[PDB]
Design a protein around this ligand. Sequence first.
Ligand SMILES: CCC(CC)(c1ccc(CC[C@H](O)C(C)(C)C)c(C)c1)c1ccc(OC[C@@H](O)CCC(=O)O)c(C)c1
Length: 250
Amino acid sequence: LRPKLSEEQQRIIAILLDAHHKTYDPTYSDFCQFRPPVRVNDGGGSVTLELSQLSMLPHLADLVSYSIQKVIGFAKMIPGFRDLTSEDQIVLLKSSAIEVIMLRSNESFTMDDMSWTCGNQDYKYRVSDVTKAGHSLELIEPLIKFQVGLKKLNLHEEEHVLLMAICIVSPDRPGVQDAALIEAIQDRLSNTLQTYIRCRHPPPLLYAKMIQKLADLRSLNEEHSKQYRCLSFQPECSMKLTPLVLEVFG
Ligand SMILES: CCC(CC)(c1ccc(CC[C@H](O)C(C)(C)C)c(C)c1)c1ccc(OC[C@@H](O)CCC(=O)O)c(C)c1
């Protein structure tokens, strides 16, 4: 059966598209405001050198912090998110932050060269930049695998916004209180997505592939958290971060 999108589901799609359009700048016009990228000699990707310099960390922390602000803005516009308690809203935002960042970064990701192209060459990010921020291959390899896999799905903007919203409003996050209300909000979103795929996505399993991407995001989140922990041990690392990054990850 291919039921039609209800007027409510059409309203949800319109709200989420409008939310993304208001919170995502496809021109990357604010990037010149961040602390500048620094790309030092590190041809070998030396762990000792990367930790001593953390050359790309001030820029990447400003980029992530900026992205988190946009995610907070987007989440506030998800139908039903404001009905949740502010304690639950915060638990959901903190727990999903890195996952939504990985999802939203897909829009600038390019399979042409496996980079995130954000305007000029200074804002063309690669694997080597994440290593320059003190991260290891245990995070980077699955991260690129994820970007390619997601890119290959060729999601409609409607599916992309629905996927980010479903990611945020997850009832299975540690510390949530009203899991039942969260699940009801997510089910409303999930039903919209499944109905949308069946009636709007032309052929040539997409919903199941999008659900697997959410499971892939949990693993990446766990790996990122382990790496953030190592990075936090580096003396004076907090100066290279932001108050928002320190709260979300620390
Ligand atoms: C450079 C790659 C990547 C990929 C997800 C990234 C960047 C940095 C890191 C280290 C993070 C560190 O562990 C800590 C927490 C700061 C300490 C990692 C692991 C991946 C990245 C690329 C582009 C990005 O955004 C482009 C657009 O979407 C931005 C506009 C908008 O979102 O609205 C963002 C957000 C991130």
